[PDB]
Short mmCIF file of all heavy atoms in Angstrom, two decimals:
data_model
loop_
_atom_site.label_atom_id
_atom_site.label_comp_id
_atom_site.label_asym_id
_atom_site.label_seq_id
_atom_site.Cartn_x
_atom_site.Cartn_y
_atom_site.Cartn_z
N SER A 131 60.36 118.50 -32.82
CA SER A 131 60.20 118.77 -31.43
C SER A 131 59.70 120.21 -31.27
O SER A 131 60.27 121.15 -31.85
CB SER A 131 61.49 118.59 -30.60
OG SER A 131 61.79 117.21 -30.61
N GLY A 132 58.61 120.40 -30.51
CA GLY A 132 58.10 121.68 -30.19
C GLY A 132 56.61 121.64 -29.88
O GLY A 132 56.03 120.55 -29.82
N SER A 133 56.06 122.83 -29.61
CA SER A 133 54.64 122.92 -29.18
C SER A 133 54.02 124.18 -29.70
O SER A 133 54.68 125.21 -29.76
CB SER A 133 54.48 122.83 -27.68
OG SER A 133 53.10 122.82 -27.25
N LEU A 134 52.75 124.11 -30.02
CA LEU A 134 51.94 125.30 -30.37
C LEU A 134 50.96 125.62 -29.32
O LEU A 134 50.14 126.55 -29.55
CB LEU A 134 51.28 125.16 -31.76
CG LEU A 134 52.22 125.19 -32.91
CD1 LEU A 134 51.53 124.90 -34.24
CD2 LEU A 134 52.93 126.48 -33.04
N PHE A 135 50.94 124.99 -28.16
CA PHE A 135 50.03 125.40 -27.08
C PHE A 135 50.55 126.65 -26.44
O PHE A 135 51.74 126.71 -26.08
CB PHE A 135 49.83 124.31 -26.07
CG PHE A 135 48.95 123.20 -26.57
CD1 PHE A 135 49.44 122.13 -27.26
CD2 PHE A 135 47.63 123.21 -26.40
CE1 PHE A 135 48.67 121.14 -27.77
CE2 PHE A 135 46.82 122.20 -26.89
CZ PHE A 135 47.34 121.16 -27.58
N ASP A 136 49.65 127.59 -26.18
CA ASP A 136 50.07 128.75 -25.38
C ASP A 136 50.42 128.31 -23.99
O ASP A 136 49.74 127.47 -23.40
CB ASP A 136 48.86 129.73 -25.40
CG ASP A 136 49.14 131.08 -24.70
OD1 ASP A 136 49.70 131.16 -23.61
OD2 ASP A 136 48.66 132.08 -25.28
N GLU A 137 51.50 128.90 -23.40
CA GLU A 137 51.82 128.56 -22.04
C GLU A 137 50.75 128.81 -21.03
O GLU A 137 50.72 128.14 -20.01
CB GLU A 137 53.17 129.23 -21.60
CG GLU A 137 53.07 130.66 -21.31
CD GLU A 137 54.45 131.27 -20.90
OE1 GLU A 137 55.60 130.62 -20.88
OE2 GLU A 137 54.32 132.44 -20.61
N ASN A 138 49.83 129.72 -21.32
CA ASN A 138 48.74 129.99 -20.41
C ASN A 138 47.53 129.04 -20.55
O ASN A 138 46.52 129.17 -19.84
CB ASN A 138 48.30 131.43 -20.58
CG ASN A 138 49.43 132.42 -20.17
OD1 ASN A 138 50.10 132.24 -19.14
ND2 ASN A 138 49.74 133.32 -21.07
N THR A 139 47.57 128.15 -21.57
CA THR A 139 46.50 127.16 -21.68
C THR A 139 46.77 126.08 -20.63
O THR A 139 47.78 125.36 -20.74
CB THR A 139 46.53 126.57 -23.12
OG1 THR A 139 46.26 127.62 -24.02
CG2 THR A 139 45.47 125.44 -23.25
N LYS A 140 45.92 125.98 -19.63
CA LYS A 140 46.17 125.11 -18.53
C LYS A 140 45.56 123.76 -18.68
O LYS A 140 46.03 122.87 -17.98
CB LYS A 140 45.61 125.75 -17.23
CG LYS A 140 46.31 127.08 -16.82
CD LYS A 140 47.84 127.08 -17.02
CE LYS A 140 48.51 128.41 -16.60
NZ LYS A 140 49.97 128.39 -16.95
N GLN A 141 44.58 123.59 -19.57
CA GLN A 141 43.83 122.33 -19.74
C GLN A 141 44.33 121.65 -21.03
O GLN A 141 44.37 122.32 -22.07
CB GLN A 141 42.34 122.54 -19.81
CG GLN A 141 41.69 123.25 -18.56
CD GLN A 141 40.26 123.68 -18.87
OE1 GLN A 141 40.00 124.24 -19.93
NE2 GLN A 141 39.30 123.43 -17.92
N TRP A 142 44.68 120.39 -20.91
CA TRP A 142 45.01 119.57 -22.11
C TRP A 142 46.09 120.20 -22.94
O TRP A 142 46.06 120.12 -24.18
CB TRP A 142 43.73 119.22 -22.88
CG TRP A 142 42.86 118.22 -22.17
CD1 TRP A 142 42.34 118.31 -20.93
CD2 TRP A 142 42.40 116.94 -22.72
NE1 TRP A 142 41.60 117.17 -20.63
CE2 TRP A 142 41.64 116.30 -21.69
CE3 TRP A 142 42.51 116.31 -23.97
CZ2 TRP A 142 41.02 115.08 -21.91
CZ3 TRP A 142 41.94 115.08 -24.14
CH2 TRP A 142 41.25 114.45 -23.10
N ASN A 143 47.09 120.77 -22.28
CA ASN A 143 48.20 121.36 -22.89
C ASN A 143 49.24 120.25 -23.04
O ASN A 143 49.76 119.73 -22.07
CB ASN A 143 48.74 122.46 -22.03
CG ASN A 143 49.96 123.17 -22.67
OD1 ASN A 143 50.79 122.56 -23.31
ND2 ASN A 143 50.07 124.49 -22.51
#
Side-chain angles (χ1 to χ4, degrees):
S131 292
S133 184
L134 291 174
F135 286 88
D136 184 315
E137 76 181 3
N138 296 316
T139 297
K140 296 319 180 186
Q141 302 167 315
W142 289 57
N143 181 323

